[model samples]
Target: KETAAAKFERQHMDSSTSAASSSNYCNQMMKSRNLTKDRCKPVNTFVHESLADVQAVCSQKNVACKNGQTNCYQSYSTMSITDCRETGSSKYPNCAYKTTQANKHIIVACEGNPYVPVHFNASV
Candidate 1:
């Protein structure tokens, strides 16, 4: 079984990835990265920054988690990110997505003994 920490890294971490270059980027990533298994992740954002910077967000100010948990934190600096939104025509086993680029502070849910990022809550 995949641990939440591992899953988080797999789903959200892309420290070395460049910004999306085409509309098909999400379609490729979501599938190649296994995020499309069972069903597509309707919306997701991949960070094109360092893991150190991401982990450092844990020490930043606390904020409301997307799920209403109290352990979320918001980044102090804007980050380069690529958003993948499911297209209206997208359907199961045939997921399609639109790619968008943005610079925004990300909010994430932290968990475990060391309080590492476990979920991508939002970006602002």
Candidate 2:
């Protein structure tokens, strides 16, 4: 079974694709990365930085989660990330996405032994 940590790595890590800034990127990546399965993930982020740098975010400044959870942490350095958001008329059968890349700090929730990112709360 795929763990949450492993899933995060699959959905978010994209160091080699940091330069893939085309609008169709999310459309292709969402399917290739298996995010568009039974349903479309409304919002997702793909970090273009190294995994070690992403793991280090666990020790960054703490922040409140989007839903008021207190376990979220924010990254200290600006990271290159591609934001994938479903279009307005997007449906399950035919998923559509808008891709936008930006350099921003990420917010993620961590858990388990060697605390690592689990839920990608947001980027701010």
Candidate 3:
């Protein structure tokens, strides 16, 4: 059987004139592989971010964005805990965490006028 990544690449491997076009193809391929939206939970592992924006990102990329409570997102098999820890020096303080889980792939949105390039890891 073909692995997820292999299947993804096979479906998305197309000639394109521009990087954006290639990325778009990849997005479509990812979406096709994981087409069930309700199957995955919308979890925003990143802090201080807009859920709408995240949903838009997922939509644009053709991936599922689980919108609900914290644990709801965690319920998805595709989702995983990337990291977790206390927010401050105090051990009893509030905590923060990160995740590699995304709709299809992780999108790193840069914050600047010039628009810095974003890179992401494929590992789960």
For model 1, the run of ten residues with the poorest summed lDDT: 13-22
Q: What is the TM-score of each candidate against the true structure?
A: 0.93, 0.92, 0.19
Per-residue lDDT tens digits of candidate 3, residues 8-79? 233322222212222133223233434223332122222122333322332233222243222111111232
Instruction: Summarize candidate 2's per-residue lDDT along 70-107 as a digit string, tens digits.
Output: 88999988899998899997888679999888999999
Question: What does candidate 1 score on TM?
Answer: 0.93
**Clash count for each candidate, listed in order shown:** 0, 0, 2
lDDT of 3 at 96: 26
lDDT of each: 0.88, 0.88, 0.27
Query: Which residue pairs overlap in candidate 2's backbone?
Result: none
Candidate 3's C-alpha lDDT? 0.27
Off by over 4 Å in 3: 1-44, 63-124
Colliding residue pairs in candidate 3: 41-66, 42-66
